[PDB]
Structures are given as structure tokens and as C-alpha cells.
PDB file of C-alpha atoms in Angstrom:
ATOM      1  CA  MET A   1      12.107 -27.188 -11.824  1.00  0.00           C
ATOM      2  CA  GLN A   2      15.140 -29.448 -11.400  1.00  0.00           C
ATOM      3  CA  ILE A   3      18.232 -28.281  -9.562  1.00  0.00           C
ATOM      4  CA  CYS A   4      20.840 -29.860  -7.309  1.00  0.00           C
ATOM      5  CA  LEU A   5      19.881 -28.764  -3.804  1.00  0.00           C
ATOM      6  CA  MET A   6      22.817 -28.707  -1.339  1.00  0.00           C
ATOM      7  CA  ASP A   7      22.717 -28.087   2.405  1.00  0.00           C
ATOM      8  CA  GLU A   8      25.683 -26.396   4.085  1.00  0.00           C
ATOM      9  CA  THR A   9      23.903 -24.915   7.113  1.00  0.00           C
ATOM     10  CA  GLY A  10      24.367 -27.887   9.405  1.00  0.00           C
ATOM     11  CA  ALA A  11      21.039 -27.174  11.095  1.00  0.00           C
ATOM     12  CA  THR A  12      19.111 -30.326  10.190  1.00  0.00           C
ATOM     13  CA  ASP A  13      15.833 -28.388  10.666  1.00  0.00           C
ATOM     14  CA  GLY A  14      14.545 -29.253   7.188  1.00  0.00           C
ATOM     15  CA  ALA A  15      14.771 -25.692   5.883  1.00  0.00           C
ATOM     16  CA  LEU A  16      16.182 -26.815   2.526  1.00  0.00           C
ATOM     17  CA  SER A  17      13.333 -29.282   2.017  1.00  0.00           C
ATOM     18  CA  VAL A  18      10.729 -26.609   2.823  1.00  0.00           C
ATOM     19  CA  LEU A  19      12.367 -24.095   0.482  1.00  0.00           C
ATOM     20  CA  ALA A  20      12.259 -26.637  -2.357  1.00  0.00           C
ATOM     21  CA  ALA A  21       8.581 -27.363  -1.672  1.00  0.00           C
ATOM     22  CA  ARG A  22       7.969 -23.600  -1.359  1.00  0.00           C
ATOM     23  CA  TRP A  23       9.396 -22.856  -4.829  1.00  0.00           C
ATOM     24  CA  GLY A  24       8.453 -26.105  -6.563  1.00  0.00           C
ATOM     25  CA  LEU A  25      12.050 -27.264  -6.973  1.00  0.00           C
ATOM     26  CA  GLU A  26      12.936 -30.916  -7.520  1.00  0.00           C
ATOM     27  CA  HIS A  27      16.279 -32.260  -6.385  1.00  0.00           C
ATOM     28  CA  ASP A  28      18.420 -33.411  -9.281  1.00  0.00           C
ATOM     29  CA  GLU A  29      21.715 -34.960  -8.172  1.00  0.00           C
ATOM     30  CA  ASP A  30      23.077 -34.906 -11.724  1.00  0.00           C
ATOM     31  CA  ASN A  31      22.033 -31.319 -12.469  1.00  0.00           C
ATOM     32  CA  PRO A  32      24.863 -29.049 -13.688  1.00  0.00           C
ATOM     33  CA  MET A  33      23.683 -26.278 -11.345  1.00  0.00           C
ATOM     34  CA  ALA A  34      23.425 -26.384  -7.542  1.00  0.00           C
ATOM     35  CA  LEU A  35      21.318 -24.194  -5.239  1.00  0.00           C
ATOM     36  CA  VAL A  36      23.191 -24.068  -1.934  1.00  0.00           C
ATOM     37  CA  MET A  37      21.838 -22.961   1.409  1.00  0.00           C
ATOM     38  CA  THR A  38      24.597 -21.636   3.684  1.00  0.00           C
ATOM     39  CA  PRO A  39      24.228 -20.487   7.298  1.00  0.00           C
ATOM     40  CA  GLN A  40      24.061 -16.927   5.958  1.00  0.00           C
ATOM     41  CA  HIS A  41      22.498 -17.013   2.489  1.00  0.00           C
ATOM     42  CA  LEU A  42      21.228 -19.022  -0.473  1.00  0.00           C
ATOM     43  CA  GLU A  43      23.629 -19.107  -3.456  1.00  0.00           C
ATOM     44  CA  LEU A  44      24.035 -20.560  -6.952  1.00  0.00           C
ATOM     45  CA  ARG A  45      27.073 -22.592  -8.114  1.00  0.00           C
ATOM     46  CA  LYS A  46      28.177 -23.937 -11.482  1.00  0.00           C
ATOM     47  CA  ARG A  47      29.212 -27.400 -10.244  1.00  0.00           C
ATOM     48  CA  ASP A  48      31.718 -28.188 -13.031  1.00  0.00           C
ATOM     49  CA  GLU A  49      33.490 -24.949 -12.126  1.00  0.00           C
ATOM     50  CA  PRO A  50      34.276 -24.774  -8.385  1.00  0.00           C
ATOM     51  CA  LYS A  51      36.841 -22.004  -8.824  1.00  0.00           C
ATOM     52  CA  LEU A  52      34.031 -19.714 -10.008  1.00  0.00           C
ATOM     53  CA  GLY A  53      32.476 -19.822  -6.560  1.00  0.00           C
ATOM     54  CA  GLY A  54      28.820 -19.236  -5.818  1.00  0.00           C
ATOM     55  CA  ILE A  55      26.682 -16.189  -6.500  1.00  0.00           C
ATOM     56  CA  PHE A  56      23.969 -14.682  -4.292  1.00  0.00           C
ATOM     57  CA  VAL A  57      21.716 -11.610  -4.193  1.00  0.00           C
ATOM     58  CA  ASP A  58      23.133  -8.992  -1.835  1.00  0.00           C
ATOM     59  CA  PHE A  59      21.485  -5.590  -1.517  1.00  0.00           C
ATOM     60  CA  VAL A  60      23.357  -4.628   1.658  1.00  0.00           C
ATOM     61  CA  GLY A  61      27.019  -5.005   0.797  1.00  0.00           C
ATOM     62  CA  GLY A  62      29.436  -6.084  -1.899  1.00  0.00           C
ATOM     63  CA  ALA A  63      29.245  -4.722  -5.427  1.00  0.00           C
ATOM     64  CA  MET A  64      25.710  -3.368  -4.918  1.00  0.00           C
ATOM     65  CA  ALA A  65      26.709  -1.261  -1.898  1.00  0.00           C
ATOM     66  CA  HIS A  66      29.550   0.272  -3.903  1.00  0.00           C
ATOM     67  CA  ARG A  67      27.401   0.787  -6.981  1.00  0.00           C
ATOM     68  CA  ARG A  68      24.965   2.680  -4.750  1.00  0.00           C
ATOM     69  CA  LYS A  69      27.685   5.216  -3.919  1.00  0.00           C
ATOM     70  CA  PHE A  70      29.705   5.392  -7.152  1.00  0.00           C
ATOM     71  CA  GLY A  71      27.356   3.959  -9.753  1.00  0.00           C
ATOM     72  CA  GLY A  72      25.770   7.339 -10.324  1.00  0.00           C
ATOM     73  CA  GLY A  73      22.499   6.903  -8.479  1.00  0.00           C
ATOM     74  CA  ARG A  74      19.970   9.151 -10.194  1.00  0.00           C
ATOM     75  CA  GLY A  75      22.891   9.782 -12.539  1.00  0.00           C
ATOM     76  CA  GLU A  76      22.982   6.202 -13.859  1.00  0.00           C
ATOM     77  CA  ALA A  77      21.977   5.524 -17.460  1.00  0.00           C
ATOM     78  CA  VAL A  78      19.106   3.230 -16.459  1.00  0.00           C
ATOM     79  CA  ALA A  79      17.763   5.875 -14.055  1.00  0.00           C
ATOM     80  CA  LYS A  80      17.786   8.484 -16.805  1.00  0.00           C
ATOM     81  CA  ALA A  81      16.208   5.915 -19.146  1.00  0.00           C
ATOM     82  CA  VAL A  82      13.176   5.401 -16.890  1.00  0.00           C
ATOM     83  CA  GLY A  83      12.802   9.178 -16.779  1.00  0.00           C
ATOM     84  CA  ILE A  84      13.991   9.925 -13.255  1.00  0.00           C
ATOM     85  CA  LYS A  85      14.223  13.704 -13.440  1.00  0.00           C
ATOM     86  CA  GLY A  86      13.731  16.359 -10.794  1.00  0.00           C
ATOM     87  CA  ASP A  87      11.423  15.048  -8.083  1.00  0.00           C
ATOM     88  CA  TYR A  88       9.772  12.523 -10.406  1.00  0.00           C
ATOM     89  CA  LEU A  89      10.121   8.962  -9.016  1.00  0.00           C
ATOM     90  CA  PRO A  90       7.935   6.684 -11.197  1.00  0.00           C
ATOM     91  CA  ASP A  91       6.515   3.376 -10.003  1.00  0.00           C
ATOM     92  CA  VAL A  92       8.451   0.713 -11.880  1.00  0.00           C
ATOM     93  CA  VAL A  93       7.818  -2.897 -12.709  1.00  0.00           C
ATOM     94  CA  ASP A  94      11.049  -4.745 -13.516  1.00  0.00           C
ATOM     95  CA  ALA A  95       9.510  -7.509 -15.632  1.00  0.00           C
ATOM     96  CA  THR A  96      12.833  -9.428 -15.864  1.00  0.00           C
ATOM     97  CA  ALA A  97      14.095  -9.270 -12.238  1.00  0.00           C
ATOM     98  CA  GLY A  98      17.274 -11.276 -12.775  1.00  0.00           C
ATOM     99  CA  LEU A  99      19.755 -10.718  -9.941  1.00  0.00           C
ATOM    100  CA  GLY A 100      17.961  -7.523  -8.929  1.00  0.00           C
ATOM    101  CA  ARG A 101      20.864  -5.174  -9.664  1.00  0.00           C
ATOM    102  CA  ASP A 102      19.052  -2.590 -11.780  1.00  0.00           C
ATOM    103  CA  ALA A 103      15.856  -2.976  -9.754  1.00  0.00           C
ATOM    104  CA  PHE A 104      17.786  -2.073  -6.603  1.00  0.00           C
ATOM    105  CA  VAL A 105      19.392   0.973  -8.214  1.00  0.00           C
ATOM    106  CA  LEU A 106      15.955   2.327  -9.122  1.00  0.00           C
ATOM    107  CA  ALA A 107      14.572   1.633  -5.637  1.00  0.00           C
ATOM    108  CA  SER A 108      17.603   3.227  -4.001  1.00  0.00           C
ATOM    109  CA  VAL A 109      17.009   6.440  -5.915  1.00  0.00           C
ATOM    110  CA  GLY A 110      13.435   6.515  -4.620  1.00  0.00           C
ATOM    111  CA  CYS A 111      11.287   4.560  -7.108  1.00  0.00           C
ATOM    112  CA  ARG A 112       8.779   1.992  -5.871  1.00  0.00           C
ATOM    113  CA  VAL A 113       9.801  -1.152  -7.752  1.00  0.00           C
ATOM    114  CA  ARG A 114       8.066  -4.479  -8.175  1.00  0.00           C
ATOM    115  CA  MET A 115      10.162  -7.250  -9.760  1.00  0.00           C
ATOM    116  CA  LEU A 116       8.574 -10.075 -11.709  1.00  0.00           C
ATOM    117  CA  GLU A 117      10.584 -13.290 -11.851  1.00  0.00           C
ATOM    118  CA  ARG A 118       9.267 -16.417 -13.553  1.00  0.00           C
ATOM    119  CA  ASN A 119      12.230 -18.718 -12.846  1.00  0.00           C
ATOM    120  CA  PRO A 120      11.595 -20.441  -9.454  1.00  0.00           C
ATOM    121  CA  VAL A 121      15.289 -20.844  -8.571  1.00  0.00           C
ATOM    122  CA  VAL A 122      15.972 -17.148  -9.332  1.00  0.00           C
ATOM    123  CA  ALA A 123      12.922 -16.141  -7.280  1.00  0.00           C
ATOM    124  CA  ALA A 124      14.269 -18.178  -4.372  1.00  0.00           C
ATOM    125  CA  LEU A 125      17.641 -16.393  -4.771  1.00  0.00           C
ATOM    126  CA  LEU A 126      15.971 -12.958  -4.971  1.00  0.00           C
ATOM    127  CA  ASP A 127      13.677 -13.809  -2.085  1.00  0.00           C
ATOM    128  CA  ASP A 128      16.700 -14.653   0.084  1.00  0.00           C
ATOM    129  CA  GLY A 129      18.329 -11.387  -0.949  1.00  0.00           C
ATOM    130  CA  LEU A 130      15.228  -9.447   0.122  1.00  0.00           C
ATOM    131  CA  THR A 131      15.039 -11.146   3.516  1.00  0.00           C
ATOM    132  CA  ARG A 132      18.591 -10.195   4.359  1.00  0.00           C
ATOM    133  CA  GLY A 133      17.932  -6.767   2.853  1.00  0.00           C
ATOM    134  CA  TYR A 134      14.770  -6.120   4.868  1.00  0.00           C
ATOM    135  CA  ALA A 135      16.655  -7.024   8.058  1.00  0.00           C
ATOM    136  CA  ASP A 136      19.264  -4.327   7.356  1.00  0.00           C
ATOM    137  CA  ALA A 137      19.160  -1.479   9.871  1.00  0.00           C
ATOM    138  CA  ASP A 138      19.896   1.083   7.185  1.00  0.00           C
ATOM    139  CA  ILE A 139      17.801   0.147   4.137  1.00  0.00           C
ATOM    140  CA  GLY A 140      15.612  -2.560   5.655  1.00  0.00           C
ATOM    141  CA  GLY A 141      12.766  -0.139   6.279  1.00  0.00           C
ATOM    142  CA  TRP A 142      12.389   1.518   2.884  1.00  0.00           C
ATOM    143  CA  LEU A 143      13.467  -1.544   0.908  1.00  0.00           C
ATOM    144  CA  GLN A 144      10.322  -3.385   2.065  1.00  0.00           C
ATOM    145  CA  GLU A 145       8.137  -0.739   0.475  1.00  0.00           C
ATOM    146  CA  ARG A 146      10.210   0.174  -2.576  1.00  0.00           C
ATOM    147  CA  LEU A 147      11.455  -3.244  -3.702  1.00  0.00           C
ATOM    148  CA  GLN A 148       9.070  -6.180  -3.847  1.00  0.00           C
ATOM    149  CA  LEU A 149       9.090  -9.535  -5.629  1.00  0.00           C
ATOM    150  CA  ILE A 150       6.327 -11.273  -7.573  1.00  0.00           C
ATOM    151  CA  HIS A 151       6.886 -14.837  -8.813  1.00  0.00           C
ATOM    152  CA  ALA A 152       5.217 -15.425 -12.204  1.00  0.00           C
ATOM    153  CA  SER A 153       5.591 -14.858 -15.971  1.00  0.00           C
ATOM    154  CA  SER A 154       5.704 -11.299 -17.325  1.00  0.00           C
ATOM    155  CA  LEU A 155       3.962 -12.453 -20.488  1.00  0.00           C
ATOM    156  CA  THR A 156       0.680 -13.225 -18.718  1.00  0.00           C
ATOM    157  CA  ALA A 157       0.819 -11.934 -15.151  1.00  0.00           C
ATOM    158  CA  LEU A 158       2.098  -8.541 -16.304  1.00  0.00           C
ATOM    159  CA  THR A 159      -1.212  -7.350 -17.737  1.00  0.00           C
ATOM    160  CA  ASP A 160      -2.771  -8.318 -14.410  1.00  0.00           C
ATOM    161  CA  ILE A 161      -0.446  -6.002 -12.487  1.00  0.00           C
ATOM    162  CA  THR A 162      -2.267  -3.208 -10.639  1.00  0.00           C
ATOM    163  CA  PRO A 163      -2.138  -0.377  -9.868  1.00  0.00           C
ATOM    164  CA  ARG A 164      -0.413   0.178 -13.213  1.00  0.00           C
ATOM    165  CA  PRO A 165       3.155   1.554 -13.062  1.00  0.00           C
ATOM    166  CA  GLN A 166       4.351   4.512 -15.122  1.00  0.00           C
ATOM    167  CA  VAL A 167       7.399   2.511 -16.259  1.00  0.00           C
ATOM    168  CA  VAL A 168       8.162  -1.077 -17.186  1.00  0.00           C
ATOM    169  CA  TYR A 169      11.808  -2.184 -17.318  1.00  0.00           C
ATOM    170  CA  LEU A 170      13.015  -5.033 -19.512  1.00  0.00           C
ATOM    171  CA  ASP A 171      16.407  -6.752 -19.591  1.00  0.00           C
ATOM    172  CA  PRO A 172      15.878 -10.339 -20.826  1.00  0.00           C
ATOM    173  CA  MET A 173      18.860 -12.663 -21.104  1.00  0.00           C
ATOM    174  CA  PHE A 174      20.411 -11.944 -24.494  1.00  0.00           C
ATOM    175  CA  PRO A 175      22.074 -14.758 -26.514  1.00  0.00           C
ATOM    176  CA  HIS A 176      25.551 -13.377 -25.730  1.00  0.00           C
ATOM    177  CA  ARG A 177      28.130 -14.530 -28.273  1.00  0.00           C
ATOM    178  CA  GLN A 178      31.217 -12.534 -27.291  1.00  0.00           C
ATOM    179  CA  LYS A 179      33.400 -14.361 -24.785  1.00  0.00           C
ATOM    180  CA  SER A 180      34.091 -10.908 -23.339  1.00  0.00           C
ATOM    181  CA  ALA A 181      30.581 -10.906 -21.875  1.00  0.00           C
ATOM    182  CA  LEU A 182      31.264 -14.419 -20.573  1.00  0.00           C
ATOM    183  CA  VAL A 183      34.340 -13.563 -18.506  1.00  0.00           C
ATOM    184  CA  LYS A 184      32.867 -12.502 -15.173  1.00  0.00           C
ATOM    185  CA  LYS A 185      31.650 -15.302 -12.910  1.00  0.00           C
ATOM    186  CA  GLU A 186      28.306 -13.645 -12.168  1.00  0.00           C
ATOM    187  CA  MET A 187      27.269 -14.065 -15.782  1.00  0.00           C
ATOM    188  CA  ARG A 188      29.006 -17.366 -16.483  1.00  0.00           C
ATOM    189  CA  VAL A 189      27.008 -18.814 -13.601  1.00  0.00           C
ATOM    190  CA  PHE A 190      23.645 -17.083 -13.991  1.00  0.00           C
ATOM    191  CA  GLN A 191      23.579 -17.786 -17.749  1.00  0.00           C
ATOM    192  CA  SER A 192      24.257 -21.478 -17.130  1.00  0.00           C
ATOM    193  CA  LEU A 193      21.062 -21.532 -15.047  1.00  0.00           C
ATOM    194  CA  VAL A 194      18.477 -19.496 -16.949  1.00  0.00           C
ATOM    195  CA  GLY A 195      20.065 -19.439 -20.393  1.00  0.00           C
ATOM    196  CA  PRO A 196      18.949 -17.115 -23.214  1.00  0.00           C
ATOM    197  CA  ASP A 197      15.289 -16.062 -23.008  1.00  0.00           C
ATOM    198  CA  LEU A 198      14.140 -17.705 -26.227  1.00  0.00           C
ATOM    199  CA  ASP A 199      10.773 -15.912 -26.007  1.00  0.00           C
ATOM    200  CA  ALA A 200      12.193 -12.442 -25.189  1.00  0.00           C
ATOM    201  CA  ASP A 201      10.552 -10.705 -28.165  1.00  0.00           C
ATOM    202  CA  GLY A 202       7.135 -11.395 -26.670  1.00  0.00           C
ATOM    203  CA  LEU A 203       7.842  -9.118 -23.695  1.00  0.00           C
ATOM    204  CA  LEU A 204       7.555  -5.744 -25.466  1.00  0.00           C
ATOM    205  CA  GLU A 205       3.860  -5.879 -26.406  1.00  0.00           C
ATOM    206  CA  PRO A 206       2.534  -6.626 -22.900  1.00  0.00           C
ATOM    207  CA  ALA A 207       5.130  -4.283 -21.368  1.00  0.00           C
ATOM    208  CA  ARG A 208       3.811  -1.338 -23.357  1.00  0.00           C
ATOM    209  CA  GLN A 209       0.228  -2.123 -22.319  1.00  0.00           C
ATOM    210  CA  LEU A 210       1.044  -2.117 -18.599  1.00  0.00           C
ATOM    211  CA  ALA A 211       3.247   0.978 -18.492  1.00  0.00           C
ATOM    212  CA  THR A 212       1.261   4.201 -18.500  1.00  0.00           C
ATOM    213  CA  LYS A 213       4.252   6.267 -19.594  1.00  0.00           C
ATOM    214  CA  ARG A 214       7.373   4.381 -20.631  1.00  0.00           C
ATOM    215  CA  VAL A 215       9.086   1.069 -21.302  1.00  0.00           C
ATOM    216  CA  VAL A 216      12.871   0.792 -21.074  1.00  0.00           C
ATOM    217  CA  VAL A 217      14.722  -2.104 -22.704  1.00  0.00           C
ATOM    218  CA  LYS A 218      18.382  -2.734 -21.914  1.00  0.00           C
ATOM    219  CA  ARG A 219      20.169  -3.998 -25.036  1.00  0.00           C
ATOM    220  CA  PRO A 220      23.842  -4.803 -25.687  1.00  0.00           C
ATOM    221  CA  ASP A 221      25.604  -2.852 -28.437  1.00  0.00           C
ATOM    222  CA  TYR A 222      24.717  -3.722 -32.020  1.00  0.00           C
ATOM    223  CA  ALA A 223      21.913  -5.892 -30.676  1.00  0.00           C
ATOM    224  CA  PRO A 224      18.626  -5.486 -32.605  1.00  0.00           C
ATOM    225  CA  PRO A 225      15.690  -3.785 -30.855  1.00  0.00           C
ATOM    226  CA  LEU A 226      13.307  -6.090 -28.983  1.00  0.00           C
ATOM    227  CA  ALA A 227      10.609  -7.577 -31.244  1.00  0.00           C
ATOM    228  CA  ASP A 228      12.428  -5.711 -34.023  1.00  0.00           C
ATOM    229  CA  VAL A 229      10.386  -2.625 -33.133  1.00  0.00           C
ATOM    230  CA  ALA A 230      12.548   0.391 -33.930  1.00  0.00           C
ATOM    231  CA  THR A 231      12.639   3.501 -31.766  1.00  0.00           C
ATOM    232  CA  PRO A 232      14.505   6.824 -32.085  1.00  0.00           C
ATOM    233  CA  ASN A 233      14.542   7.240 -28.298  1.00  0.00           C
ATOM    234  CA  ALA A 234      17.527   5.642 -26.560  1.00  0.00           C
ATOM    235  CA  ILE A 235      20.323   6.316 -24.079  1.00  0.00           C
ATOM    236  CA  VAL A 236      23.685   4.935 -25.214  1.00  0.00           C
ATOM    237  CA  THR A 237      25.987   3.884 -22.368  1.00  0.00           C
ATOM    238  CA  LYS A 238      29.223   1.884 -22.193  1.00  0.00           C
ATOM    239  CA  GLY A 239      28.710  -1.498 -23.813  1.00  0.00           C
ATOM    240  CA  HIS A 240      24.964  -1.205 -24.103  1.00  0.00           C
ATOM    241  CA  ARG A 241      21.994   1.064 -24.718  1.00  0.00           C
ATOM    242  CA  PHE A 242      18.487   1.542 -23.351  1.00  0.00           C
ATOM    243  CA  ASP A 243      15.714   1.652 -25.972  1.00  0.00           C
ATOM    244  CA  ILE A 244      12.703   3.749 -24.927  1.00  0.00           C
ATOM    245  CA  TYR A 245       9.082   3.181 -25.937  1.00  0.00           C
ATOM    246  CA  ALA A 246       5.707   4.667 -25.100  1.00  0.00           C
ATOM    247  CA  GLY A 247       3.185   2.887 -22.898  1.00  0.00           C
ATOM    248  CA  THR A 248      -0.619   2.966 -22.739  1.00  0.00           C
ATOM    249  CA  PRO A 249      -2.329   6.042 -21.189  1.00  0.00           C
ATOM    250  CA  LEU A 250      -4.795   5.689 -18.331  1.00  0.00           C
ATOM    251  CA  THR A 251      -8.442   4.942 -19.135  1.00  0.00           C
ATOM    252  CA  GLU A 252     -10.786   5.325 -16.142  1.00  0.00           C
ATOM    253  CA  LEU A 253      -8.499   7.694 -14.255  1.00  0.00           C
ATOM    254  CA  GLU A 254     -10.499   7.439 -11.012  1.00  0.00           C
TER     255      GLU A 254
END
């Protein structure tokens, strides 16, 4: 994948070159997006918009830290969508990793989450977020077990996932039209990198085969259900809803 790689670490150790080789990235000086390595983290910038700043995955502080304390925790809509109730903490596969926000919420509540990311630049960004997260003295320890990353497509490598999780979470990039959704920098930048997931409808089928209990799909308001498959089960939140589907029961069952 092409991206404008930029080095701002001033270490001349070749780290940036290794990272690119590691994730199969190819330097593109004229690319509209830049992947920047700083002395602290790896971030994404929308070159034609400097004033938007760069974005990076941060599980320790910032918005995520606050969301962990005031977001609702097991009280969040997504948590209730995946079925977190009582002392039930289902293994979850976040098939559309993204920036890791929802995946982290579920892990923080106690769920063992595995995130699947097919976009190499996003995997590099998530990977960098995990490294800093694992080094944390507070969450570092449990984060390593409850939040892992797998780089591949969820339309082919999802059915190969084992042991099978009880829940599969889906939140593909929707073709946002409202400029209201394109106000915050986080989205104006991330969307300029990955863009709408043209093949999003193909995620439901394989997601329901992996999950042994439930599949949750985050969808903005008025947005049609994924793959146009209707469902009477859904949690309506503020600005969006979470459609709920059944999975595929165990077979061998040890």
C-alpha cells in the first residue's frame, strides 16, 4: 500500500524503513495521506489539512481514558449489544478494528477481544497503540491478554479464526453523507485514508458463521441494515443503533 512515510524521530536508526517493510507499505511522496513516526508514537495526517493535526491510537490516555471512566463501561450501548450481562464476558472478534475505540471498551469491561484489520497502515497504527498500551503500568498486563491484533481480511481469515468467539462485532466505514459526521478531525482524517468499505455487505455472512452466539453491527441512524438483512433485535443509541443477529452454534463441542 502507498502512503507518504515521514520521519520525525531524529534517530536515524532506520526504524521507519523497517516499519514500512514490516507492513508492506510503499513510500509515495505525492500521497494525500502521511504516516508519521514521532519519538513517542506513530500517527496519521491529512497533508492538505495541517490544522487538523495527526491522529494516533491511544489506549492509555486522552479520549479513551476518559471514555473508560464516563463512557458507561458495561453500561455502554455497544457493551449491552454484545450481551455483556451479569458475569458474562464473551470472547469477541472485532472484525473491523478501525481505531480500536469500541474494541478497547469491550476489553476494558473484561471481554477477551481480537481485532481483525485488513488495512496495513491502520494495522501499523493499531500495532503502535498496543505497544504503548502493553507498556502501561496500569493496563499493560491485562491488555496483552484481552486485546490482540490480527492483520488480514475479515472476509476470508474470519472463518479461519479459532477458537470461535461467542460474539463478532462489525462497524465498517459507512458512506457518510452528512457533513455533521465529517466535522471532527478523527473522522475527517481516518476516512480520507480508508474511505467507505465498498464491500461492507459481504461481512455479515461470514460474521454469523464465526460467532457462536451473536453478531453486533453498528449502524448510523436511518442507515439500512448490513446486507439488507432485517432484524427485530437492536439497541438504539444517540446517533446510531446496533443491529443484533444470531451466530452459528457449536458442532463438535469437545
